[PDB]
Amino acid sequence: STGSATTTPIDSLDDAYITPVQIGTPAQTLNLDFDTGSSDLWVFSSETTASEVDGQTIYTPSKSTTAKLLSGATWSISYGDGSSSSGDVYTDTVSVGGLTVTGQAVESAKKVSSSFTEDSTIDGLLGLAFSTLNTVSPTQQKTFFDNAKASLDSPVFTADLGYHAPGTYNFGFIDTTAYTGSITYTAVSTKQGFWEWTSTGYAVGSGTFKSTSIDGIADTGTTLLYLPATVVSAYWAQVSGAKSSSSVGGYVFPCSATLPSFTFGVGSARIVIPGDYIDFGPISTGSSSCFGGIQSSAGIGINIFGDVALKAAFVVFNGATTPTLGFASK
């Protein structure tokens, strides 16, 4: 089997992407944030504290003839941005782009943090990291991909995120029309539960490539590119007037600037992030100070190849017995 679904930016900055997901019988379609940095499929629901729902579409398990309470199971998650959610668990039928999993754990939120409430466009998350990170207790549950894998034509999914435009998540096949040149594959460590890999270096603009190993994670659920402070300083030094602002929370730059590109290495291959991908617009409405899309990972404890990086590539998440990651230009 295969599946193919379009993923759409939630706003004009590509702050996140939402993908429609069918849950239950009859189908209830929710727009979920596909997150390769976590491993829980959780949704706003009829169980979510009423004051914490503000415009989201909810899953109502009592209206699904295939929903079953997973007795005694609870979940609770905290994300790297300080947001969180928790609740109980149903199993139900879940379909993405024509690919169906029966008996998928659907984690129903009883509580969500303010950042989730305040984002009316995201109805929940669909985790695509390794199932070892799943938070369901006392019996850990599998991701949608892990459940689908054996049935797929090939045990892979691909992320093709657009810049200020829709893109695609495919399951079970590689669309050879969706990228240019070849796909370069690179090793993955699953030791921390992530799609963790090592970039071979970087360049800023038309500058020379610096060969240096940068361990980090391919994370579709993180907006920006978080890299070591040395790398980030080298980038922003090429933008007149750019500075790190403790009060804003990262590098800012004059909105009048033209940003240089940023290149990262995948083995001997190179992925080029155009400068415009690094612009996250005014820090507040009407400001001439703009927020940068490349930020320091210092004090995160891990480097994160988030959407800023991934949307410059066609990315293969290869879930073979020994997982790997592939990157192609597009």
Swiss-Prot record:
Disulfide bonds join 255-290. It is an enzyme of class 3 (hydrolase). GO terms for biological process: proteolysis. The active site is at residues 35, 199. Keywords: Aspartyl protease, Disulfide bond, Hydrolase, Protease, Signal, Zymogen. One of its GO terms (molecular function) is aspartic-type endopeptidase activity. Residues 17-328 form the Peptidase A1 domain. Its EC number is 3.4.23.22. It comes from the Eukaryota. It catalyses: Hydrolysis of proteins with specificity similar to that of pepsin A, prefers hydrophobic residues at P1 and P1', but does not cleave 14-Ala-|-Leu-15 in the B chain of insulin or Z-Glu-Tyr. Clots milk. Belongs to the peptidase A1 family. This is Endothiapepsin. It comes from Cryphonectria parasitica (Chestnut blight fungus). The lineage of its organism: Eukaryota, Fungi, Dikarya, Ascomycota, Pezizomycotina. The chain holds residues 90 to 419 of 419 of the full protein.
